[PDB]
Structures are given as C-alpha cells and as structure tokens.
Design a binder for this molecule. Sequence first.
Ligand SMILES: CC(C)(C)n1ncc(Cl)c(Cl)c1=O
Lengths: 336, 324
Amino acid sequence: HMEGLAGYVYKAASEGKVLTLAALLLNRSESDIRYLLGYVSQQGGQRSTPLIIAARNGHAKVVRLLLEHYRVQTQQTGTVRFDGYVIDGATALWCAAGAGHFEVVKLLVSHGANVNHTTVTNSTPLRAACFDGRLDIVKYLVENNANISIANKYDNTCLMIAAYKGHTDVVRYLLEQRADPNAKAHCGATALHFAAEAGHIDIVKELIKWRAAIVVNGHGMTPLKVAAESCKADVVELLLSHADCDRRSRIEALELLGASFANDRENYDIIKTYHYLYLAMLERFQDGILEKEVLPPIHAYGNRTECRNPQELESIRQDRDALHMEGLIVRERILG
Amino acid sequence: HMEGLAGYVYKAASEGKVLTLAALLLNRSESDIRYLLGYVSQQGGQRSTPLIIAARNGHAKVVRLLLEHYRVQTQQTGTVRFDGYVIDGATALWCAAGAGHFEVVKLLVSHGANVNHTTVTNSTPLRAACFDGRLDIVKYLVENNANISIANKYDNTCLMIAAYKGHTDVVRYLLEQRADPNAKAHCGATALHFAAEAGHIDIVKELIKWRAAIVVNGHGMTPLKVAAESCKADVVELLLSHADCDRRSRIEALELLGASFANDRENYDIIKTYHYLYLAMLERFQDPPIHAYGNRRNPQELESIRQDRDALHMEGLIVRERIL
Ligand SMILES: CC(C)(C)n1ncc(Cl)c(Cl)c1=O
C-alpha cells in the first residue's frame, strides 16, 4: 500500500509543495521515510527520486527540507528527460546544473553533493551548466573544485560545448581557469573547430587570445576550412588575419568560402561567390604559377570545367547560372 | 561638340521626362537624330541606348514617343544592370520584360519587337518574366508568339526557372506545352527536380496532374527524390505515393531523410533524424560501411538503433556518407 504514498510524495516533491510534502513525511517510521524518498518513479521516460525531481524543477524549498530535516542522500541517481533526449546516471546536482537552478545547485553543493559526479556518458554537472550557459553556476561549480578536464564519452570538453553553444561569457571564464584549448575529441575537433563552424566570432577571438593550436579534425579540415565550408565569412577573415599554411591553405579557404556562397541555400549570395573565388585566383598569380588541379567534366555540374585563368573567371562574372555550377565544381575539388 | 548633346538626350531618356527630351530632339536634321539616338553611353557599369534605358526604368511615357513617333529599331542592343549582375545582349523588349514593366512590354511588342530575341545567355523575355515571376507579362508574351521552348544556355527552360523560383502560378499556366523538359540537359535535372530541390510542394503536385504530364521520374544522379537530401519531407512523402517505382516494387526507396536532418544546420532536427531513419530498419525488416576514425553507427540490425545519445548525429552522418 506504500507504493502509492511514494507517488504522492514524488508529486509533492516535483510540484514544490513543501507543506504537502512535509505533511506526508511526518508520522512515519525511519524504515518508511527512507523508502518514500529512495523510491524511483517512472514518469514517462523520466525515472527519478523526490530529491532529484525537485532539483530538476528548481523547487529549492523541497530541496532544503529533504537535505536538512530528512538528511536525504545526494548520491541518488536517476534517468532524467532534458529536451527530448533522456540522460542517464544523473544526480540532483546534475539536473539542477542543466536546468540553471542556481540556488538548488548551491543547496546541493553546500550540503555536500559531488560536483564531479559523472553521468553514464561522463557528463559532469559542470558540463550541463556549460551547455546551458549559466556563468554564475559555472563559476560556483569550479570554485567548489568541479573539474574542467572531465570530458564526454567522446572527449567533448566543457570548453568545446560552450564554444559550440555560443556562450562567450563561460568560454572566456573557462579559459581564465586555464582550460586546455587544444584538447581534441573523437571527432578530432577543437573548441576552435566548433566555434568556427558555428560562427561565434567572439569565442573564436577568445580562443585566439589564448593561443589555440590550429589542428585538423578527422576529415582534414582546419578551423578555417570548417568555417569556410560553413559559410561563416566573418570567422574566415579573422582566422586568416593570423596563421595558416599560407598561399595553399589560404587560397583553398577563400575558394571554399566562395563555393559555399552558392551551395548553402540559407546565405546563398553569388556576388559573394565571385568575390572570394576571384580573390583566390588573384592570389594564385603572384609568382606568375599556382597549380589549378582541375578535374574532368561530369554529367552532373553540366559539362563545364572549373576556371584556371583569371580571364576564364572574369568571363562568368555576369553569368549567374555558370557561377552557381562553378561553386559546386569548386566544392567538389576541395572536398570530393 | 555633338557627343555632349548625346549625353543630355540620354539623361532625359533615362529619367523618363519625355517633355524634356523633345526640347533637345526637335529642330534637328536626320544626320544628327540618327547619332543622338544610337549613341552608347557608359553610366557606371551599364552601357546602353536611350530606347533601352527608358524601357529598363519603365518610363512608358518616353517609350511611347521613341517607339511610336519614329519607329526606332527594337534590335538595338545594350548591357543593362539588373540589381546584382550585369546582363549583356539585352534589348528594350528584354529589359522591360525583366523589370516587370507591363505597360512598356505591351508597347514594345505591339510596335514590332523581336518577341523571342535571346540575350547573350539566350535568355528570352519569356525567361525573364518566369524568372521574376510576373504571370501578367508571362501570359501576354505567350499569345504574342514568344516561343516557350526556347530556353537559355545549359538548356534551362522557362518552366525550369519558374519551377525553381516557386512561381506556381506561371507553372500551371506554362503547361500549355512541354512538361518533363530538356532534362536540364547540362545539370541532368527535370523541371520537377528543381521543384523537389526547393520543396515547392505546390507545383510538384502540378507536375503530375492538374496540367502537367506524368513527367519522367528518371534522373540518375539522385532520382527526382532529391528532396530527401534537400530535407523537403513534404514532397518526399508526396513522391512516395506514386508506387511500383518509388514504393510497392521499389524496395530501394529508402530515401532516409533523417541523415539530412542531422547535417543541414538550418533545418537540423536530430529527433526527425531517428524518426525517418528508424523507418528504414522497420521497412528493411518487413519480410554497410567501415568505421572511419571510429564510426559504424549505420547498421539497422544492430539493436535497431539504441537512440537517445547525440551519437546519432555522427550516425546520421555515416548514413549520408554511405548513400553518397
Ligand atoms: C562541417 C564539417 C562537417 C566539415 N565539420 N564542421 C565542424 C567540425 Cl568541428 C568538424 Cl570536425 C567538421 O567536420
């Protein structure tokens, strides 16, 4: 019969009804108080504890009570639903971090919760807050000895995800806490790779100030080819305004940028196509003698052949259709 | 000294102040009037003739005088700027068509303009009106013997450009002729292919019934189900209804949109990735690649997808890599 009361207790905890929760908990034996609070409930996909669901919903009142008066264990783990995806191996500290409930986080940390508890995929509660972007929590966790080096299943640092999610504030903070910006992932990607693809120019600048290495992913893409391919012209100029395998890599990143202005249907500007593509050809002709390794015609892309001469390119500056197909040919060479 | 007056005449023509032009043009000999109206002027990038510059800016008023009073030749050619690229081989008939100046269009063709005259890229005024999408002009050109079969270089028919530019209205009307057209010849694409790429579900229905023929579903380098890559689920299901080619016998019609729903960062839904991709395992089990830098996952037999993790992202990429 006590299986039902555990649900009533869960309800009140998930609803933040501290009086409703407190009313249920008294006039119960120590044997019972443990059971009701250690019970795991299956609300759809989510499988949680009264403590966990309260910290998930930011009900600091229920959280304070469960920790102080009824000394509930912070180590309790559950499977919580964030967005549509289900995260397993989560603790009340982790949910509170992912949902941005600063006071509940402090409550859990203050009452002795493990800041470095790892989820099933080794997502630390610090990572949840870097995904979410709450600098106050991010600061508080690291100040309470949460480890920044604890990465994903796939070695996705807290720096990486924050750079991906565009949190310039936490990214800088993580970099002012000496976070290794040259750390890479299974994908082979650095935080500069994620920022360049996502075009977060402020973070790309921040990762530069902190002397990030120009490394290559598991496709042969530097952060400049990633940003050139992602049609993020802003981050292309900045990344080019420093280091690069100059000449060869620089023309290939300008040719990729120009190609993407014809492919990517969101930012499709064929005027920006000719600008970058012609700039590339001109840089190819400094000692002229820079190799145009063109490929034979295909049945797709018409039967055209990629221009090798700056006069060939000048002759399709006023052809919208030829310039489009040329951007497809360009992409084909650099990427295949 | 007479080159200077040619500029004043151009100016008044370009601004459409027809009354101002007569003051310059009157009291002049045949020798001069020929030069004054045939001068080519370089106003920025565009280098054109007064008759054209009037028709480009839609000044029907100056056009009436220049075409009616002195039957000047519509064949005069120039290079006009249409907001972006500069087009060469344009005639007043073409510019007025491209600029959507219906009044100038009617006047130009009525006075004997070459209605199927092609630009440098063999763009007919009919192409211009379907590109920009003015059905009023599109129709009017067709009754006046403009040829719908003309198309440009690379064989992009007027149907194709309208099919791409989503001008459903012109498409329905335009089916007074060819459906499944020039196969883009160069691109290898049908007018319905451009429709599927752009996901204009409205015309793709037309390409089959209510005007257009059946249109060949054949292209090779991706069937007309290009929309699976273009993340156009709307037309993807639509094409799937036509069966025995894309459904009943066609077991291979595993379009697997979900791979594209993880790649395109504009329409990226990894929930939609697993949804369509799981149909593949379910359809594959009614009755494979390599691990590049630690990959597949792609198998449908393996658990029929464990789900939940972001790993599906890289898994959606493996699918795209396999299908190419
Ligand atoms: C766009 C694409 C697929 C080239 N790409 N973008 C970003 C990153 Cl971080 C990597 Cl590793 C990558 O390969």
